[PDB]
């Protein structure tokens, strides 16, 4: 693993909010998978409409 700070490349004075991650997903990460599903989970009794 090679990791280095990117203050020169990926840092903006106004605030970089471009990186987002996901909450809900049913299946586990199978080896060598790329899934772009947009399913929203019904994790309770009130449906998410």
């Amino acid at each position: 693993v090679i990791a280095w700070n990117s203050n020169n490349l990926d840092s903006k004075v106004g605030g970089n909010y471009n990186y987002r991650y996901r909450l809900f997903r049913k299946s586990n990460l199978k080896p060598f998978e790329r899934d772009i599903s947009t399913e929203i989970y019904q994790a309770g009794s009130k449906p998410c409409n």
Partner: antibody
Amino acid sequence: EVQLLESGGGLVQPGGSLRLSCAASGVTVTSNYMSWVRQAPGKGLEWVSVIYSGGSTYYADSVKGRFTISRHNSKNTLYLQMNSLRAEDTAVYYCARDLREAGGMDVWGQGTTVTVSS
Amino acid sequence: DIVMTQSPSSLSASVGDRVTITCQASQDINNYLNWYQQKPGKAPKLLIYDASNLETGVPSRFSGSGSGTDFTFTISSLQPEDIATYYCQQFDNLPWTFGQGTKVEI
């Protein structure tokens, strides 16, 4: 429909086995976040353990090897058998459906206390 | 690890006085602190999340603010229902240790 009920707790002695359990309905413990947390008397909340999606177990510092966690989707239940306990473990424990970082512990139940007095 | 050294733990005041709660942290919390209402003996109830947004149900007499090292909680209209212990929590650096909370009793 959705509900997280608590079972277990009592007056087990230090080093004595006990079983705490959180039975869920409406969610899936195996493929979603869930957690157990303690609250000591006279002290603030203390994180205990989490179960993630993908078979990855993470615990706190003091419960790294003293608790045993196992999950089942047959009734959507999480079980923690605790052995080799300590006297300080007397505290009010909660099972929570923590949903990452959008406000911690937004939803609360009742919670059950565990006294480890001799 | 992020640990908060909050100076006040139990402050007593008369009826109608303002409530100002300051929670200092060792490291910078990035818009990621919460304010709860826990009440004497009752379970904590979350009011302020993500340091800027209000939850539906929270009374207008409660306010929370902060983005960085400094975090503030303000109550202008003092009520007997506000006798409680307000906690500051940082869900920012793993492990997410909880705060001690300052106890206001009138």
